[PDB]
Amino acid sequence: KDYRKKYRKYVRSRFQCILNKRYTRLRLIKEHIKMELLFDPDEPVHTVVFQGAAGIGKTILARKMMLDWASGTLYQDRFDYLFYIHCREVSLVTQRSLGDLIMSCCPDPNPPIHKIVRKPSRILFLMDGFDELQGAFDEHIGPLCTDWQKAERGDILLSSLIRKKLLPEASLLITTRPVALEKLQHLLDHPRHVEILGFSEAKRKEYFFKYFSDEAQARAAFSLIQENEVLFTMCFIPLVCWIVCTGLKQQMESGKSLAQTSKTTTAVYVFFLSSLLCAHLWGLCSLAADGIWNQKILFEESDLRNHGLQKADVSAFLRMNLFQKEVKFYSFIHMTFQEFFAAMYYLLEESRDVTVLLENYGKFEKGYLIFVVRFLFGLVNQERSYLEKKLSCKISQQIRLELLKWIEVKAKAKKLQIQPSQLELFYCLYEMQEEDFVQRAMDYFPKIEINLSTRMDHMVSSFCIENCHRV
Ligand SMILES: CN[C@@H]1COc2c(S(=O)(=O)NC(=O)Nc3c4c(cc5c3CCC5)CCC4)cnn2C1
Ligand SMILES: Nc1ncnc2c1ncn2[C@@H]1O[C@H](COP(=O)(O)OP(=O)(O)O)[C@@H](O)[C@H]1O
Ligand SMILES: [Mg+2]
């Protein structure tokens, strides 16, 4: 078992940072709890899927579980190997074997894979970010592989592993956004489903106090945040807390008095961009658009140079908080920022037509284009800064009109998880505060049905309904 201890030590080394102290627990609701009882029966479950909103903390949950297992505190008598598969890195088109996939996660270049697969009952895989798989993923592609040694396409390998036909006795855990279940239904095998909820108000304050190392700064920041309620109730998503606290730190550097007027998600992201920030921006948005359309999330130095980085602007300027270097490869800190920049790509004047963008919306192959549409809804409103002089004005009109038409076609129907749901058609309107546009769009709802499960849910529904009287 010497290699077992070596792998545990290497994993401890990798997942030590994010640090452990920074972790703030999030809620969970099984049956959709005890973290050590997830894989026990109440026969035994072999697949458990964690569903949650983007930015809710799926990846950090996976990394914390990794660290806990490495420390020997969690599943200490259940699993012997805990292989972290980052779905962002895995490529569907490329031909690879499961042995090579396992080797890609090990410390040394000579893993006893043959020894490892002797006891598959003590092996668990962590497919973190299923919606992040790039390219087209056929639901019924085959034939499904059987043995790890053999090499097949990424699609076949991933699907066969998911269908519990490759290493049948191995345990699996996939962390997916709920939008992607439409394609994950056909593959799952008697799955268990768990949900990540968000940050409670008490845990919101806890995070705000752990962010800072001095009492005065944390107290002032919390006081400023609480005094406005929309941002505070939208702060149950940890990524919003991260953005707001990082911006607060940036403002606190200088003597300027703190301030946060952000009312919507688009406003939050725009405030972040302004706080942390021409030739620099157009390439920054072209990179995001190309990555979204061409199914590229990680970009090589050559790719960065192609768009306009000009051998610079990323060593210091953009990497400050936007980009992140991984393993030559520079990605975006969070996919939401990439989608924000892709949406901005449609609203810069020196810009592909939005009609083709909307035509393929909610598709798994194209990345579901969800945050892109929401962010271009938010960014186009005329009511909403040095940046507003940059985004194109005339084109807005055209896209505005097209958006309206989209609404007209998407309300004469019903949908629950196929993506343009009534609630999601409303979230998009909420991002566009303009009263006139919201009224005209709401004019296309002869009947309304909505399922409400959070407080932001209730706020958005109430805002849409208030203008929905139809006069
Ligand atoms: C009725 N559909 C609503 C559609 O959305 C959403 C998701 S998600 O996968 O779309 N994720 C998000 O929408 N995340 C999100 C983010 C920010 C701010 C807000 C949300 C949702 C509440 C407000 C900033 C970072 C990501 C999950 N449930 N719902 C609710
Ligand atoms: N427990 C936590 N403590 C501190 N920050 C968190 C926590 N959970 C999530 N976050 C923040 O929320 C953001 C969500 O990103 P991440 O969880 O890595 O990916 P995903 O959005 O797929 O879950 C992160 O940038 C992180 O800073
Ligand atoms: Mg993630």
Coordinates of C-alpha atoms and ligand atoms in Angstrom, one line a residue:
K1 CA 0.0 0.0 0.0
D2 CA 3.1 2.2 -0.1
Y3 CA 1.8 3.8 -3.3
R4 CA -1.5 4.4 -1.5
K5 CA 0.2 6.5 1.1
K6 CA 2.2 8.3 -1.6
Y7 CA -0.9 9.2 -3.5
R8 CA -2.6 10.4 -0.3
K9 CA 0.4 12.6 0.5
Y10 CA 0.5 14.0 -3.1
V11 CA -3.3 14.8 -3.0
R12 CA -2.8 16.4 0.4
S13 CA -0.1 18.6 -1.2
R14 CA -2.4 19.6 -4.2
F15 CA -5.6 20.4 -2.3
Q16 CA -4.0 22.1 0.7
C17 CA -4.8 25.5 -0.7
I18 CA -8.0 26.8 -2.3
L19 CA -6.8 27.7 2.2
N20 CA -8.6 25.3 4.5
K21 CA -9.5 28.1 7.0
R22 CA -11.3 29.9 4.2
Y23 CA -14.0 27.2 3.8
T24 CA -17.5 28.2 4.9
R25 CA -20.0 25.3 4.9
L26 CA -23.0 25.4 2.6
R27 CA -26.3 23.7 3.0
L28 CA -27.4 20.4 1.5
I29 CA -30.7 18.7 1.0
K30 CA -30.6 15.0 0.2
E31 CA -33.6 13.1 -1.2
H32 CA -34.0 15.7 -3.9
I33 CA -26.9 15.7 6.2
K34 CA -23.9 13.6 7.2
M35 CA -21.1 13.8 4.6
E36 CA -19.9 10.3 5.6
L37 CA -23.4 8.7 5.0
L38 CA -23.8 9.8 1.4
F39 CA -22.8 6.4 0.0
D40 CA -24.5 4.3 2.6
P41 CA -28.1 3.0 2.0
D42 CA -31.2 4.2 3.7
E43 CA -28.9 -1.7 -1.9
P44 CA -25.8 0.5 -1.7
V45 CA -25.7 3.5 -4.0
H46 CA -23.1 3.7 -6.7
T47 CA -23.9 7.0 -8.3
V48 CA -24.6 10.3 -6.5
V49 CA -25.0 13.6 -8.3
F50 CA -24.6 17.0 -6.8
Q51 CA -26.8 19.7 -8.4
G52 CA -26.4 23.4 -7.8
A53 CA -26.3 26.8 -9.4
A54 CA -23.2 28.2 -11.1
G55 CA -20.9 29.8 -8.6
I56 CA -22.6 28.0 -5.7
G57 CA -19.5 26.0 -4.6
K58 CA -19.6 22.7 -6.5
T59 CA -15.9 22.7 -7.3
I60 CA -14.8 23.9 -3.8
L61 CA -17.0 21.2 -2.3
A62 CA -15.2 18.6 -4.4
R63 CA -11.8 20.0 -3.4
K64 CA -12.7 20.1 0.3
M65 CA -13.8 16.5 0.1
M66 CA -10.5 15.7 -1.6
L67 CA -8.6 17.4 1.2
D68 CA -10.7 15.7 3.9
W69 CA -10.0 12.2 2.4
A70 CA -6.3 13.0 2.1
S71 CA -6.2 14.0 5.8
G72 CA -7.8 10.7 6.6
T73 CA -10.9 12.1 8.3
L74 CA -13.5 11.3 5.6
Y75 CA -14.4 8.0 4.1
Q76 CA -11.4 6.6 6.0
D77 CA -12.7 3.0 5.8
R78 CA -14.7 3.1 2.5
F79 CA -12.5 4.1 -0.4
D80 CA -8.8 3.5 -1.1
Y81 CA -8.3 5.8 -4.1
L82 CA -10.1 9.1 -4.8
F83 CA -9.4 10.1 -8.4
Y84 CA -10.3 13.7 -9.2
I85 CA -11.3 14.1 -12.9
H86 CA -11.6 17.8 -13.8
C87 CA -14.2 17.7 -16.6
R88 CA -12.7 21.0 -17.8
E89 CA -9.5 19.3 -18.8
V90 CA -11.0 16.1 -20.2
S91 CA -11.3 16.3 -24.0
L92 CA -14.1 14.4 -25.8
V93 CA -12.5 14.1 -29.2
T94 CA -9.1 13.0 -28.1
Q95 CA -8.5 9.2 -27.9
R96 CA -7.4 8.2 -24.4
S97 CA -7.7 5.1 -22.1
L98 CA -8.9 5.0 -18.6
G99 CA -5.5 3.8 -17.5
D100 CA -4.0 6.9 -19.0
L101 CA -6.8 9.0 -17.4
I102 CA -5.9 7.6 -14.0
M103 CA -2.2 8.1 -14.7
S104 CA -3.0 11.8 -15.4
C105 CA -4.0 12.2 -11.8
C106 CA -1.1 10.5 -10.1
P107 CA 2.2 11.9 -8.7
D108 CA 4.8 9.8 -10.4
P109 CA 4.9 8.6 -14.0
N110 CA 4.7 4.9 -13.0
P111 CA 1.4 4.2 -11.3
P112 CA 0.6 0.6 -10.3
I113 CA -2.6 0.8 -12.3
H114 CA -2.7 -2.9 -12.6
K115 CA -2.4 -3.2 -8.9
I116 CA -5.0 -0.3 -8.4
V117 CA -7.7 -2.0 -10.5
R118 CA -7.4 -5.2 -8.5
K119 CA -9.9 -3.9 -6.0
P120 CA -12.4 -1.6 -7.9
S121 CA -14.8 -1.6 -4.9
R122 CA -12.5 1.0 -3.2
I123 CA -12.3 3.4 -6.1
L124 CA -14.4 6.5 -6.5
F125 CA -14.3 9.0 -9.3
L126 CA -15.3 12.7 -9.1
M127 CA -16.6 14.1 -12.4
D128 CA -16.6 17.7 -11.4
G129 CA -18.3 20.0 -13.9
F130 CA -20.2 17.7 -16.3
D131 CA -21.8 20.7 -18.0
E132 CA -18.2 21.9 -18.7
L133 CA -17.5 19.0 -21.2
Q134 CA -16.5 20.7 -24.5
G135 CA -18.0 19.7 -27.8
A136 CA -21.0 17.5 -28.8
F137 CA -21.9 14.6 -26.4
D138 CA -24.1 12.1 -28.1
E139 CA -26.6 10.5 -25.6
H140 CA -26.5 7.0 -27.2
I141 CA -23.0 6.8 -28.7
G142 CA -21.5 3.3 -28.8
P143 CA -20.4 0.6 -28.5
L144 CA -19.5 1.2 -24.8
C145 CA -15.9 0.2 -23.9
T146 CA -15.3 -2.6 -21.4
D147 CA -11.7 -2.6 -20.2
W148 CA -9.5 0.3 -19.0
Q149 CA -6.5 -0.9 -21.1
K150 CA -8.2 -0.2 -24.4
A151 CA -8.2 3.3 -25.9
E152 CA -11.4 4.9 -27.3
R153 CA -12.7 8.4 -27.9
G154 CA -13.4 10.7 -24.9
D155 CA -17.1 10.4 -25.5
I156 CA -17.1 6.6 -25.4
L157 CA -14.8 6.5 -22.3
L158 CA -16.8 9.0 -20.3
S159 CA -20.2 7.5 -21.2
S160 CA -19.1 4.0 -20.5
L161 CA -17.7 5.1 -17.1
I162 CA -21.0 6.9 -16.4
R163 CA -23.1 3.9 -17.4
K164 CA -21.3 1.8 -14.8
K165 CA -20.1 -0.7 -17.5
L166 CA -16.4 0.3 -17.2
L167 CA -15.2 -0.9 -13.8
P168 CA -18.8 -1.8 -12.8
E169 CA -18.1 -1.9 -9.1
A170 CA -16.5 1.6 -8.9
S171 CA -18.2 4.5 -7.2
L172 CA -19.0 7.7 -9.1
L173 CA -20.0 11.3 -8.1
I174 CA -20.8 13.9 -10.8
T175 CA -21.3 17.6 -10.0
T176 CA -23.6 19.1 -12.6
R177 CA -25.6 22.3 -13.1
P178 CA -29.3 21.4 -13.3
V179 CA -29.5 22.5 -16.9
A180 CA -27.3 19.6 -18.0
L181 CA -29.4 16.9 -16.4
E182 CA -31.4 16.9 -19.7
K183 CA -28.5 15.0 -21.2
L184 CA -27.4 13.2 -18.0
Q185 CA -30.8 11.4 -17.5
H186 CA -30.2 8.7 -20.1
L187 CA -26.8 7.6 -18.6
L188 CA -27.4 7.5 -14.8
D189 CA -28.0 4.2 -13.1
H190 CA -30.4 4.4 -10.1
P191 CA -28.7 7.7 -9.1
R192 CA -28.9 9.5 -5.8
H193 CA -29.5 13.3 -6.0
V194 CA -28.2 15.9 -3.6
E195 CA -28.5 19.7 -3.8
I196 CA -26.2 22.6 -2.9
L197 CA -28.3 25.5 -1.7
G198 CA -26.1 28.5 -0.9
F199 CA -25.1 30.8 1.9
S200 CA -27.4 31.5 4.8
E201 CA -27.4 35.1 6.3
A202 CA -25.4 33.9 9.3
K203 CA -22.9 32.1 7.0
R204 CA -22.9 35.3 4.9
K205 CA -21.7 37.2 7.9
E206 CA -19.2 34.4 8.7
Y207 CA -17.7 34.6 5.2
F208 CA -17.5 38.4 5.4
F209 CA -15.6 38.2 8.6
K210 CA -13.2 35.4 7.5
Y211 CA -12.4 37.4 4.3
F212 CA -10.7 40.2 6.2
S213 CA -8.0 39.9 8.9
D214 CA -9.0 43.1 10.8
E215 CA -12.3 43.6 12.7
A216 CA -12.8 47.2 11.6
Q217 CA -12.7 46.5 7.9
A218 CA -15.0 43.5 8.1
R219 CA -17.5 45.3 10.2
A220 CA -17.5 48.3 7.9
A221 CA -17.9 46.1 4.8
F222 CA -20.7 44.1 6.3
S223 CA -22.5 47.3 7.4
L224 CA -22.2 48.7 3.9
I225 CA -23.5 45.5 2.3
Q226 CA -26.4 44.9 4.6
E227 CA -27.8 48.4 4.2
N228 CA -29.0 47.5 0.7
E229 CA -31.1 44.3 0.5
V230 CA -31.1 43.2 -3.2
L231 CA -27.3 42.6 -3.2
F232 CA -27.4 41.0 0.2
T233 CA -30.1 38.5 -0.8
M234 CA -28.3 37.9 -4.1
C235 CA -25.1 37.1 -2.0
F236 CA -26.3 33.6 -1.1
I237 CA -24.2 32.5 -4.0
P238 CA -20.6 32.4 -2.7
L239 CA -19.2 33.8 -6.0
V240 CA -21.1 37.0 -5.4
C241 CA -19.6 37.3 -1.9
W242 CA -16.1 36.7 -3.4
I243 CA -16.6 39.4 -6.1
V244 CA -18.1 41.9 -3.6
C245 CA -15.4 41.4 -1.0
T246 CA -12.6 41.5 -3.5
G247 CA -14.0 44.8 -4.9
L248 CA -14.3 46.1 -1.4
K249 CA -10.6 45.3 -0.8
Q250 CA -9.7 47.1 -4.0
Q251 CA -11.6 50.2 -3.0
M252 CA -10.2 50.1 0.6
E253 CA -6.7 50.4 -0.8
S254 CA -7.3 54.1 -1.6
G255 CA -8.9 56.6 0.7
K256 CA -12.2 56.7 -1.3
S257 CA -15.2 55.9 0.8
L258 CA -16.7 52.5 0.1
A259 CA -19.7 52.3 -2.2
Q260 CA -21.9 49.6 -3.9
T261 CA -24.9 50.6 -5.9
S262 CA -25.1 47.2 -7.7
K263 CA -28.7 46.1 -8.1
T264 CA -28.4 43.2 -10.6
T265 CA -26.0 40.4 -11.5
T266 CA -24.8 42.3 -14.6
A267 CA -24.2 45.4 -12.5
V268 CA -22.2 43.3 -10.0
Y269 CA -19.9 42.0 -12.8
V270 CA -19.6 45.4 -14.4
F271 CA -18.6 46.9 -11.1
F272 CA -16.0 44.2 -10.7
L273 CA -14.6 44.9 -14.1
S274 CA -14.5 48.6 -13.5
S275 CA -12.8 48.1 -10.2
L276 CA -10.1 45.9 -11.7
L277 CA -9.8 47.9 -15.0
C278 CA -9.1 49.8 -26.0
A279 CA -6.6 47.2 -27.2
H280 CA -6.8 45.4 -23.8
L281 CA -10.6 44.8 -23.9
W282 CA -11.4 43.8 -27.5
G283 CA -8.9 40.9 -27.4
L284 CA -10.2 40.1 -23.9
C285 CA -13.7 39.7 -25.4
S286 CA -12.7 38.0 -28.6
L287 CA -10.9 35.3 -26.6
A288 CA -14.0 34.6 -24.7
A289 CA -16.2 34.5 -27.8
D290 CA -13.9 32.2 -29.6
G291 CA -13.6 29.9 -26.6
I292 CA -17.4 29.8 -26.2
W293 CA -18.1 29.1 -29.9
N294 CA -15.1 26.8 -30.7
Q295 CA -15.5 24.9 -27.4
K296 CA -12.2 26.1 -25.9
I297 CA -12.0 26.9 -22.2
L298 CA -8.2 26.7 -21.8
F299 CA -6.0 28.9 -24.0
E300 CA -2.3 28.4 -24.7
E301 CA 0.2 31.3 -24.8
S302 CA 0.0 31.2 -28.6
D303 CA -3.8 31.5 -28.4
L304 CA -3.5 34.4 -26.1
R305 CA -1.0 36.1 -28.4
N306 CA -3.3 35.5 -31.4
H307 CA -6.2 37.7 -30.1
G308 CA -4.2 40.8 -29.2
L309 CA -2.4 40.1 -25.9
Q310 CA 0.8 41.2 -27.7
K311 CA 3.1 39.1 -25.6
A312 CA 1.9 41.1 -22.6
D313 CA -1.2 42.4 -20.8
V314 CA -1.5 39.0 -19.0
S315 CA 1.7 38.8 -17.0
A316 CA 0.5 41.6 -14.8
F317 CA -2.6 43.3 -16.1
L318 CA -5.3 40.7 -16.8
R319 CA -4.0 37.9 -14.7
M320 CA -4.5 40.1 -11.6
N321 CA -7.9 38.6 -10.9
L322 CA -9.5 37.8 -14.3
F323 CA -7.3 35.0 -15.7
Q324 CA -5.7 32.0 -14.0
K325 CA -2.7 29.9 -15.0
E326 CA -3.2 26.1 -14.8
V327 CA -0.7 23.2 -14.9
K328 CA 1.1 27.3 -20.4
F329 CA -2.7 27.3 -20.1
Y330 CA -4.5 30.5 -19.1
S331 CA -8.2 30.3 -18.3
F332 CA -10.8 32.6 -16.8
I333 CA -11.1 32.6 -13.0
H334 CA -14.7 31.4 -13.3
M335 CA -16.7 30.4 -16.4
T336 CA -19.2 33.1 -15.5
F337 CA -16.6 35.8 -16.3
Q338 CA -15.9 34.1 -19.7
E339 CA -19.6 34.1 -20.5
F340 CA -19.8 37.8 -19.4
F341 CA -17.0 38.7 -21.8
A342 CA -18.6 36.6 -24.6
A343 CA -21.8 38.5 -24.1
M344 CA -19.9 41.8 -24.2
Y345 CA -18.4 40.7 -27.5
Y346 CA -21.8 41.4 -29.1
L347 CA -21.8 45.0 -27.8
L348 CA -18.4 46.5 -28.8
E349 CA -17.9 48.9 -31.7
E350 CA -14.5 49.2 -33.4
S351 CA -19.9 41.4 -33.3
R352 CA -21.6 38.5 -34.9
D353 CA -25.4 38.7 -35.2
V354 CA -27.3 37.8 -32.1
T355 CA -29.9 35.9 -34.2
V356 CA -27.5 33.0 -34.7
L357 CA -26.6 33.1 -31.0
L358 CA -30.3 32.7 -30.0
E359 CA -30.9 30.0 -32.6
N360 CA -28.7 27.5 -30.6
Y361 CA -29.7 28.3 -27.0
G362 CA -29.8 25.7 -24.3
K363 CA -27.9 23.2 -26.3
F364 CA -25.4 21.0 -24.5
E365 CA -22.9 21.1 -27.4
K366 CA -22.7 24.9 -27.5
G367 CA -22.4 25.3 -23.7
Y368 CA -26.2 26.2 -23.3
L369 CA -25.4 29.9 -23.9
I370 CA -27.3 30.6 -20.7
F371 CA -25.2 33.3 -19.0
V372 CA -24.4 34.8 -22.4
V373 CA -28.1 35.6 -23.1
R374 CA -28.7 36.8 -19.5
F375 CA -25.6 39.0 -19.5
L376 CA -26.4 40.5 -22.9
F377 CA -29.9 41.2 -21.6
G378 CA -28.3 43.1 -18.7
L379 CA -25.6 44.9 -20.6
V380 CA -27.9 46.3 -23.4
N381 CA -30.3 48.3 -21.2
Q382 CA -30.0 52.0 -22.1
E383 CA -30.7 53.3 -18.6
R384 CA -27.4 51.7 -17.3
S385 CA -19.6 54.8 -15.9
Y386 CA -16.6 55.0 -18.2
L387 CA -17.6 51.7 -19.8
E388 CA -21.0 52.8 -21.1
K389 CA -19.1 55.1 -23.5
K390 CA -17.4 52.0 -24.9
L391 CA -20.2 49.5 -25.5
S392 CA -21.9 50.2 -28.9
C393 CA -25.1 52.2 -28.9
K394 CA -26.7 51.7 -32.3
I395 CA -26.3 47.9 -32.4
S396 CA -28.0 47.7 -29.1
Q397 CA -31.3 48.8 -30.7
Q398 CA -31.2 46.0 -33.2
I399 CA -30.3 43.3 -30.7
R400 CA -32.9 44.8 -28.3
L401 CA -35.6 44.3 -31.0
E402 CA -34.4 40.8 -31.6
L403 CA -34.5 40.0 -27.9
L404 CA -38.1 41.1 -27.9
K405 CA -39.0 38.8 -30.8
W406 CA -37.3 35.9 -28.9
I407 CA -39.6 36.6 -26.0
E408 CA -42.6 36.5 -28.2
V409 CA -41.7 33.1 -29.5
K410 CA -40.6 31.6 -26.1
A411 CA -43.7 32.5 -24.1
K412 CA -46.1 30.8 -26.4
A413 CA -45.0 27.5 -24.9
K414 CA -44.2 25.8 -21.6
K415 CA -40.9 24.4 -20.3
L416 CA -39.6 23.1 -17.0
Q417 CA -35.9 22.3 -17.4
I418 CA -35.5 22.6 -21.2
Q419 CA -33.9 25.9 -20.6
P420 CA -36.1 28.9 -21.5
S421 CA -38.4 28.3 -18.5
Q422 CA -40.9 31.1 -17.4
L423 CA -38.7 31.9 -14.4
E424 CA -35.6 32.1 -16.5
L425 CA -37.4 34.3 -19.1
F426 CA -38.2 36.5 -16.0
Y427 CA -34.6 36.5 -14.5
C428 CA -33.4 37.8 -17.9
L429 CA -36.0 40.6 -17.8
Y430 CA -35.0 41.4 -14.2
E431 CA -31.4 41.9 -15.4
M432 CA -32.9 44.5 -17.8
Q433 CA -34.4 46.9 -15.3
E434 CA -35.9 49.2 -18.0
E435 CA -39.5 49.5 -17.1
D436 CA -40.7 50.0 -20.7
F437 CA -39.0 46.9 -22.0
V438 CA -40.2 44.8 -19.1
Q439 CA -43.8 45.9 -19.6
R440 CA -43.7 45.2 -23.3
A441 CA -42.1 41.8 -22.8
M442 CA -44.6 40.9 -20.0
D443 CA -47.4 41.7 -22.4
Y444 CA -46.8 38.2 -23.8
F445 CA -47.9 36.2 -20.8
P446 CA -51.7 35.5 -21.0
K447 CA -51.1 33.0 -18.1
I448 CA -48.3 32.7 -15.6
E449 CA -47.0 29.7 -13.8
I450 CA -43.8 29.8 -11.6
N451 CA -42.1 27.6 -9.0
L452 CA -40.4 29.6 -6.3
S453 CA -37.7 28.1 -4.0
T454 CA -35.4 31.0 -2.9
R455 CA -35.6 34.6 -1.9
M456 CA -34.0 36.0 -5.1
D457 CA -36.6 33.8 -6.8
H458 CA -39.4 35.6 -5.0
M459 CA -37.9 39.1 -5.7
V460 CA -37.5 38.4 -9.4
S461 CA -41.0 36.9 -9.7
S462 CA -42.5 39.9 -7.8
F463 CA -40.7 42.4 -9.9
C464 CA -41.9 40.8 -13.1
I465 CA -45.4 40.4 -11.8
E466 CA -45.7 44.0 -10.7
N467 CA -45.3 45.2 -14.3
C468 CA -47.4 42.2 -15.6
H469 CA -50.9 43.6 -14.8
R470 CA -51.2 44.3 -18.6
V471 CA -53.2 47.5 -17.7
Ligands
LIG1 C1 -35.4 29.4 -12.3 N1 -34.1 29.3 -12.8 C2 -33.3 30.3 -12.2 C3 -32.1 30.7 -13.2 O1 -30.7 30.6 -12.6 C4 -30.5 29.4 -11.8 C5 -29.6 28.4 -11.7 S1 -27.9 28.4 -12.5 O2 -27.3 27.2 -12.8 O3 -28.5 29.3 -13.5 N2 -27.0 29.4 -11.8 C6 -27.3 30.9 -11.6 O4 -28.3 31.5 -12.1 N3 -26.3 31.5 -10.8 C7 -26.3 32.9 -10.5 C8 -25.0 33.7 -10.5 C9 -25.0 35.0 -10.1 C10 -26.2 35.7 -9.5 C11 -27.5 34.9 -9.5 C12 -27.5 33.6 -9.9 C13 -28.9 33.1 -9.7 C14 -29.5 34.0 -8.6 C15 -28.9 35.3 -9.0 C16 -23.6 35.6 -10.3 C17 -22.7 34.4 -10.5 C18 -23.6 33.4 -11.0 C19 -30.0 27.5 -10.9 N4 -31.2 27.7 -10.5 N5 -31.6 29.0 -11.1 C20 -32.7 29.7 -11.0
LIG2 N1 -16.9 27.5 1.1 C1 -16.5 28.6 0.4 N2 -15.6 29.5 1.0 C2 -15.2 30.5 0.3 N3 -15.5 30.8 -1.0 C3 -16.3 30.0 -1.7 C4 -16.9 28.8 -1.0 N4 -17.6 28.2 -1.9 C5 -17.6 28.9 -3.1 N5 -16.8 30.0 -2.9 C6 -16.6 31.0 -4.0 O1 -17.6 30.8 -5.0 C7 -17.0 30.7 -6.3 C8 -17.5 29.5 -7.0 O2 -16.5 28.8 -7.7 P1 -16.3 27.2 -7.7 O3 -17.1 26.7 -6.5 O4 -14.8 26.9 -7.7 O5 -17.0 26.6 -9.0 P2 -18.5 26.3 -9.2 O6 -19.1 27.7 -9.5 O7 -18.6 25.4 -10.4 O8 -19.0 25.7 -7.9 C9 -15.5 30.6 -6.1 O9 -14.8 31.6 -6.8 C10 -15.2 30.8 -4.6 O10 -14.4 31.9 -4.4
MG3 MG -16.6 24.4 -11.2

